[model samples]
Structure formats: structure tokens, C-alpha cells
Target chain A: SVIKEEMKIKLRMEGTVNGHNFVIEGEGKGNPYEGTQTMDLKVTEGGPLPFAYDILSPQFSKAFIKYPADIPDYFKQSFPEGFHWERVMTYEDGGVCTATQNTSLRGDCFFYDVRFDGVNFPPNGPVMQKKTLGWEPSTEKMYVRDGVLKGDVIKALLLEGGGHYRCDFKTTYKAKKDVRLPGYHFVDHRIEILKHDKDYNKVKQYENAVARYSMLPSQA
Target chain B: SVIKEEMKIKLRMEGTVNGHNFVIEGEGKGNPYEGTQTMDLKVTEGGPLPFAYDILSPQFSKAFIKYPADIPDYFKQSFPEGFHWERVMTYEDGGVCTATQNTSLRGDCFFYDVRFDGVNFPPNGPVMQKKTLGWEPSTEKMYVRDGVLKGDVIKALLLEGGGHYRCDFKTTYKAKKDVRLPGYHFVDHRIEILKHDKDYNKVKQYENAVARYSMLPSQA
Candidate 1:
């Protein structure tokens, strides 16, 4: 499942005589991802309705995010470059809180993978070009005063028309308790995101634009 | 001379009988290097300040600050780690800036045959270190607690006793005057640093102490 900041979610589907449940099990540190993630979904009680989910697990597992070497065949084509990680937070004190893991490749920006809608360029058929963030060095900025040219985020276009599938799950370890956290993270996101198909360009333009740069890396 | 940061330096080397005129020539990038260079008068200034020398063409010539590679074969035997750079200034941006040219192994820091009296470290040991007042790390605030311990700076230390050196140089690029205007640039830098000596444990200890975790693709 797609992980996001501030939100927690889980999904489980099982077979029962009367309670036939759909359990989504297992998670892999799917890829070396970086930047931020915005998820939208719609899941109906029986069918898939637009939904958002927030949940957590007690034990840490490389569930949905898997390193390149550990990726399965079905996901092999998905990871061309290899590995992904969350963007690190540079502290005000000059200390960098690097939230990352080692994968293949060289250089500085290799550790991050920009994830969004299944946007892809020509070579890759854009179903989440899940490996490299593909940042265009020439145009690697948040502002586009120059013009409207889909550079890196152009990769997200491939995921279009993906059949709607709803996920039902639970949140395990939450910072707080006693709250019946629902499995509608994707649901809420879909509701909000459904109005517009591709209006997220502005959000993808920069990080924490609405929150200012003050938000900590973890929070971002 | 090893060029670090690209710069325009207003350099003047006192020349006897127009000895090399000791003036600036050619051009470089980044900042210029400037500093006072003093030498003991063992022999007459006309007889080469310290060692032998020569010239190439009318426009170009090469001179040794002291010895070939400036490495005194004797110092090589004892001070394997060599001497530290003192008051030496180089120029650089946030990129590669230091290294020797002839005999090749050199940079902002240089090992000298001169030895200080009573220092237990080693012969021809490093005596002091300086800085490039004009530029430092993009992040200036250092981790005081582990500045010299776990930091990469310590791990990449060129010499111990002397540390590194930096100076400022002003370059007057007399732009064609007719086509362009005279220009100036500043070059500042850290000196030579290969790897640690046999006693790498010392630098290792410090590296860990001041090390910050960066989720980098490679060991940046």
C-alpha cells in the first residue's frame, strides 16, 4: 500500500463462512523512495468507494517498501534504477536527520525516489516508475515561472485508468489509543482528489509549500 | 601550482632582477588565493630561495616551492603522514578544489621538510592550520561536541599537527577593457586530505563521534 506522512493504515482480507474478508498481507520496503507521497482512493462497502486510510503496525517490517535486491519478479520491472527512501530533514543546527537506506546507484540524489500518481515518460509505461525520482537537473526547482512543462512528475501519467480497487485494513500502533481509527485513508484522499484528475501539479512543484519549510523532515 | 577554487588572485612574488616578475598570469575559476609566504634565508635569494628551479617558455614556466612534489625524500621515510598545510590558501566552491600537479600528490595542504622542535608527534610535523574566511561549508554551524571526532572532516583530515589551511586571493581579470570590464574573484579552501595514516584509528574514533547519518546513495 502507498505510505504517507501523518497518516497510518493497514489492510487485511480473509475468507470466512459469513465474514469473507479481503486481507492484504505482507509488506516490503517496496522501493528506495524519497520526496513526499499523496494517496487517494475510493472504496465502497461492497465495491471500492473513494477512501483514505491511517493505521500503524507494532513491529517494523519492510512491508510495502522493499529494497531492489529483495523485490519480487512481478515488481522487478517496476524498479529500474533501484531503492528509494524518505527525504532527509536538515536540522537548523546543521545536523542532518537522514531517513534513508542504502541501495544501488551512485551520487547524492540517488537515495531518493519521487512517488506520486503512476506518471511515466516515454521509455517506461508509467505505472509508478517506482525507482528513480527522475529529477531533471536543468529544471530541478519548485517554481515554474519559466513555463508549464511536465519534467520529472510527467512519469505519473502511466497509472491513469487503473481499475479502481478498494482496500480494507486496520491500524496497529498509533501514537494515541482509544480512537477507532478507520481504514479510509485512501477513501478520504479519493473523495478530495476525485474532483480534479490532474490538478496536483502545483502541489508537486515544491515541498511543504502550504506548510512553509518549517515542517520537520519526519512530518513532511 | 595546484588550483582549487577558480579565482583571480592579485599575487606578487618579489623578484630579484625581475626574477619571474612574480606576477599573476592566466586565469582560474571560483575564488583567488592570497597569503604571506616567508622563507628562511639559507642561501642568497638569487640562488633559488630554497632549492633548484627552472623555466619553460616565455609565457609559461614551472617552479617548485621547495622540492619535487615538495616531498623531501627524508621526510617521506619518517613522517609518512607528512606535514600539515599552514597559512596556505586555495580557492573552491562546494566542489573539488585541491591536489598537487607535478609528481602529482598535493593539494591545499603540503608536507614540508622543516620540522618543529620538541613536538612528540613526528618529524616535519604539521605545525598549524588556517581557514578560508570567505567561504566555509554551506552549513557553518559545526557539531561542536564531535567536530573533530565523528565528522567526515576529521576522517578526511590531510595532516594532524598542521591541520588544513585556507587563504584569500583577489584576481584582477583585466577583461578586454574594450570588450569587457576588469573583474575580480575570491578563492578560499581547505587543503590536501587523502586518507588517514597507519594510525587511522585516531581519525576513525573522531569520525564516529561527530558523524551525522545521511541517507545517501553512496558514502558522500
Candidate 2:
């Protein structure tokens, strides 16, 4: 009866990396991450690796990360002003371990960008009122990352002396797992890494330099 | 030319409390409280007293709260899940200061409520995912209160041995004359006394109890 009461939805996500496309599909019951789920993933250019994972996993399910249509009803109550999400994924779970999103004055970066036709004044102070309640006119962007792969990618990029790349993905959600949802869950989920600027050669040199200056060998 | 480039929307708020309603209207240059605004407020129940204030200012604006229906087209790449807003009121300002409604998770609550849609299995552990992503079936209530008056109300209630009473008032926003943003601003919106549980005798005894505990002997 409990499972019957639960509302199940299906998820499908597609992503493009450097020009290669990947897809992930899964099904879960209830809202958010409450019940159980099973997902299958594949890349258009490559076969299944020794392990399996979805590029757009459940971590990005946060209401904040979604486009306007992706938001559910319950989350709409507090953010009547609207919202965007800023998040960081973790290596261990490839999940969003930390995130910030709000309509109130939580000082979240995306606060002002989500606005309506009116101003929202605080019940008591002028402190929370905002003028920047819309998207920054320039460099308008949203970010999602491979909490696991990108960690290695960035490390490799920095070690190789810095470069950047763009990411594109498409995701879909449906009610019946057996049948596809009429519309897409999302399209062109994009992210751009402007630069990866760490020099590992310098770090290695510093380590080598320190190795030659051992405390025991130094003149007292 | 910069000011001319801006698109200003007007805001009007109407709130009802204790069988009385009040209105607030103002206009800002662009995108909800963008530039400057000037407004006039009046309540049906009371005349303009020496000091000006309202009882239900914040509750009305909750409707204007929303997840960026205005989000830029660039960010619209994902999410076709659809959305609905539960709304209450919008008066003269065309701004919403009073609203009530719901759809589904916007991940808008304290946001601890926005959890993963599936178990975020850690690459190394079974942690990070939560069992409570959806709204609580029973106590799905969000509280918006007057920061200033509720402070006074609670102080009054606690001082007078705590009796419960609902609050009612209207608020307005305006700008002019080098403009400190006219209209009375409130302070101390903190409200900790969620429920009143006290009696007159207890207050009297506490006052009396303090009066007799002087360092000197009572005149006898």
C-alpha cells in the first residue's frame, strides 16, 4: 500500500562531451530521492566501461538546478520569486554534496536573477531588498559537473598546464517507466570550464627542491 | 538613456486583517524594484497615526515569490516538467504582497528538503542520500511573520502573561528626494513565542517577586 501510494517517475539523461554523446535512463518512486531507483547508462561513442554511472545522476535533481518547467509544486511555495542553483559535487558519491538556492536573503548568487513583475520588501528591514534580481547580463551560465570524472579531468588539465572545455547534455523525465514522457526533461544542459590553471611541474619542482634540502643534511 | 532603457513595472499590495484592508502602490524602473519607486499607503480601518506601520505587510508579497518564470532563454534548455503556482492577492501595485498557493517541490523550503531523487550511492560509502525529499505529508506549513510587530506582539504577550492574538496591518514602499526609501521601516522581526502559554497571575507574581527581592530590608 505504501509503495502503491508512491508516485513513480522515470528519468532519462543525455550528455555530450568533447563531441561524444552519452545517455542514462532510470526509474524511481515518489518525489525527490525518497524511494528506490534503478538506472542504465551508455555513451554513444563508447561501450559500457567496467563500471556504470549516469552523467546526470540524481544529485542534480535539486529544484534549484532545474529550469523553470522542471520545478515541482511544493518547491514553488517559498521561491515564488523564482531560483537557480549553485552546487558542488563530491568525488565519493558523484552527488551534490553542497548547494545554495533560495528566494529569501540567503545571499545565494542566483537570488536576484529570479524575479517577477514586483519588488519584495522585507517584513522589517531594507537589507534583503535586491536590485540585481535578474540574470547577470553577461556570461549568463549554469553549471553541472561530473563530480567524479571532472575531478580527474581538472586535475589532469591543471597538471598539463591549463585548458577549458564545454559540456552539453539532454535529460528527460516521465511518469511511466515503460513509456517515454511526452516532452524532454531538459535539453543542452551546458557548462564551460573557462580555465584549469594549476602547474604541477612547478609543484613537482618544489617537492624536488625540498627533497634536496633535507634537515639532517643541512649545516646547523 | 540608461534609465530609458529600463522597463519598470508597478507594484500594488492589498492586505486584509481584522476585517480591515489596506493598500500600497509604487513603481520601479525595471524588473521588480529595479530603480526607484514612490508609493502612498492607506488603510480602511485606521487614520494615519503619528507613527505609520502595518500588520500584514510580508504575507501579501509571498505570492510574488516564484521560480524565475523570467529566467533567461539561455537557461531554458532543460526542464519541461511544467509548473503551477498557488497565489493569494495583488492589489494596486500589481505587485503581490499577499499570496497563498502550492504545486510541488521547488526545493524552496529551508532546502534541506531538496534531496536526491535516488540513492546517491557513494563510490566508497552508502551515505549522502536522504529518505525525506518530498514535503512532509502532515505539517507542511511555512510561517511568514512581521519581523517588527511580532517582536512587539510577543513582548506584549509575554509581558502581559501571554495571550494569543493574530496580527493585521498594511505596508508600503516609496522613493523620493535623494530618497531614504520613504515609509516607516520596522525592526526586531524576531518571533520566538510561537504559542502563548501563560496567565495574568504568573506575570503579577513575577513582578511582585522581583519587587520584594531587594538588597535592603523592607520598611516594616
Candidate 3:
């Protein structure tokens, strides 16, 4: 595996859903954490997302990450001097991503332009979203933290092809005291979506729609 | 102090802000926690809060509570058999609350009807809103097999005085695995509010409006 070591990242998305428009966001590690990573969402216009940001695409549908000088200590050891890495992320829905690494920049970022996939961001997506450059110095902390996990937290949103995406390498940390626990660090990784309809069956429809594009090539 | 023990409660409000209808929510133990208990908020209309649920009152502006079967063990010793306790909660804006406790139930409940004060809901506040009843069982699982905290937390939103209120008694919890610390229960109690405007001064306006009632007598 060229990218052998697990990397951690955070992703955020601010866009619309079904023309109603909303904001979906969350953070997690791993390309698609072995299990499921949940995100927090707020519906600005239409009804909430079935439960809240359950639509997987919104969590990482349009997210991308730009690395920094400290690109995970493992990356420094794995590549030694420097090595070029390429990633071709393909979605079940005809979404193909051809991205090359900018190893010389002292950061590792994944730029995704899946707008044509018709899965996230329908009609029109964010302008100049393709291959954009981003850098966050705070991400350095994620690598130094001993107990933190190694993976990226991705958040994306795709509604009929128009979408938005963002990635946060650093997940938030909380004092256990705030949550009534004083000995441990607190991390809220639960995914919650919003919806006005209390009907269980009707809400299930959202799950079905998201299930179509949620599968990564390998997971499929 | 009539209310000596640290009382925890979730408050919510649904109504218009500056003529723009919005739903502002928050959670805290005391008038503001010994420090400040922050809460997550969502804006469902008009525009986002000046800051985002920061002014506090909207979080528990017009709040009430109902009791449960098993009150905290300490209460058994404090009240002994049965005792009538009275509370006078005064707000900065001359909103004085004189309420009694219904401790016979398993839990201690406080009821207040401060609508006429024209602070939170305003003179033409939402129509019907006064001393509503809400309940969530012990959810004992907040304790675990080893006596740690783990379980499904509950939060609800109420409508009245042309406003909405939401309370999250149990915040999100992380497994010993979530934070890579299986030795302790991890809880994230940080407060997050959402808004489109990033301006600082404009957001302060929200505080000015909410301050009219957020004052909890002494704190004011």
C-alpha cells in the first residue's frame, strides 16, 4: 500500500439539499472508517435529513484535504526524502477521481471533482471547487497527539449533482468534566441528521436514496 | 440558597428573532453553570442567531421541569421524608419567579410561568406556552456494567409563545474506543452554534436582545 499508514482528517460541507438548502458537517478517520462515522447537520431551508445528516454523501460527498508541512510523522518516514503518490477514487455512480500528490509542498491533500457524477451537488456545484489547495497548521496536533486515531474525517454533500465538500484533519477534543466525566477525554463521533417528518417509513426513503452512492468501490 | 444543589435542565425556544423567526436552543446545569454551560443550537428560519444560541436565555429563558421516581440519592437525606421548598428566581429585567417544588416524585421538579414578564416570548410572544410537563426515565445505563456512562441520550423541542425550546439532558458520549481511551468514559460537552455571518459586532446584537432576559438576578 503506497499510503500504508492510516491518516486522520476532518471534513465539512456547507451547501443545499434537494434545492431546500442546508449545512451538513462531521469528522472521522480512515478513508471510510471500518465502521460508520457520524456528522452533525443543520437544515437551513427544507425539512431535516431523515434523522440528521444521515445522507452519507453530505458527510464526505464533496470534501477534500490539503496537507501541511508536518504530513503525519509516518509520511516523513515512509517516503523518507520524498515520493509521489497518486489516488484514483472511483464511486459506484460513475464518479472517477484522478489526483496526483504534491509531495514537494510538504503536505498531502486529496482534491475531488466529482461534480459530474450526478450524485452530489446537482445542477450546479461550488465554483472553482476542483483541485483546490487548502492548508491547516493546527492539523500538526493530530499527528503529535499520542492517543488520537490515524485517519481522515471526511464530510461531503451531494444533491442531484450540486454539492460541497471539506476535510478537517483535526477532530475536536473536550474535557471529560463538560460531559460529567472527569478522567477521560471526550469526543462526539455520533452522526445525527434532521427531519420534520415523524413518520418512520417516509424517513426511510432518505436512507434508500443515500445508500445508492454511499458505497465505495471496495465496500461495494 | 433555596436551590442549593446544582440543578441540571435543558431549555429551548422557537420564535422570531428581530422579526425573523428562528429556533434557538441550549443546555446547562445552572443559570450558566458555575462557569457557563454551552449548548448546541440550530436556526430553522429567518436568519441565524447573531452569534448562535450564545445569549443563553433562549436556551432556558422560559423553562420548567417534571420529577422522576428515583431522585438523586442525596435528596433522600436532604428532604428526609417530605419537605416543601420554595424558590425565588429573579432575572435582571425585573422578571421574578416564585415557585414551589414537587419533590414527592422520585425526582425534584421546578415549574415557572414567567411569560407575562415580556422578556423571552415578548408581549405578543407565541400563543400558548406555560409550565409544560416533560419526562425522561433514569436511563440508568448512564452507568455501565463497570459503572461507567453509556446509553441513548434524549433531547426534545417544545413550541409556545411563538417560539421553540429543546433540551439535551444527555450529551453525546464516546466509547473508551472512540477517543482511543478504553480506560475511561469520554464525553463531549462543548457547545457549537451555527451562523452564516462571521462578523463579530453584528453578532453581539443578538446578545443585546437576549441580555434583556438572560440575566439570572445575581449573575446580572
Best candidate, TM-score? 3
True interface contacts reproduced by each model, as a fraction? Answer: 0.00, 0.00, 0.00
How many Å off is the CA of A132 in candidate 3? 12
Give the alpha carbon lDDT tens digit for every residue of B117-211 in model 3. Answer: 11233333221222222211111112122222222222212232221222223211222221211211111122223232442112211111100
Candidate 2 lDDT over B1-220, as tens digits, reads 1112223323344434323343443232222112111122223223231111221222211111111322211101111221222322222112222333121212221000010011112322111111111110010111112211110111111111222111112222111112111111111121111111121100000000000011112111
Regions more than 4 Å wrong, model 2: A1-220, B1-12, B17-20, B25-220
Ordered from best to worst lDDT, the candidate numbers read: 3, 2, 1
For model 2 chain B, give the 10-residue run with minimal summed lDDT: B203-212
The C-alpha interface RMSD of every prediction is 19.8, 31.4, 23.4
Q: Model 1: what is its DockQ?
A: 0.01
In order of appearance, the predictions have TM-scores of 0.17, 0.18, 0.20
TM-score of the first chain in candidate 2 relative to the native first chain: 0.25
> At residue B158, what lDDT does model 2 achieve?
11
Most accurate candidate by lDDT: 3
TM-score of the first chain alone, every candidate: 0.16, 0.25, 0.24
- Comparing 1 with 3 on lDDT, the higher-scoring candidate is 3
Q: Per-residue lDDT for A49-69 in model 3, tens only?
A: 322222333224111122222
Error at B4, model 3, angstroms? 12
Model 3: residues with Cα > 4 Å off, grouped in runs: A1-72, A77-79, A83-121, A127-150, A154-220, B1-6, B10-220
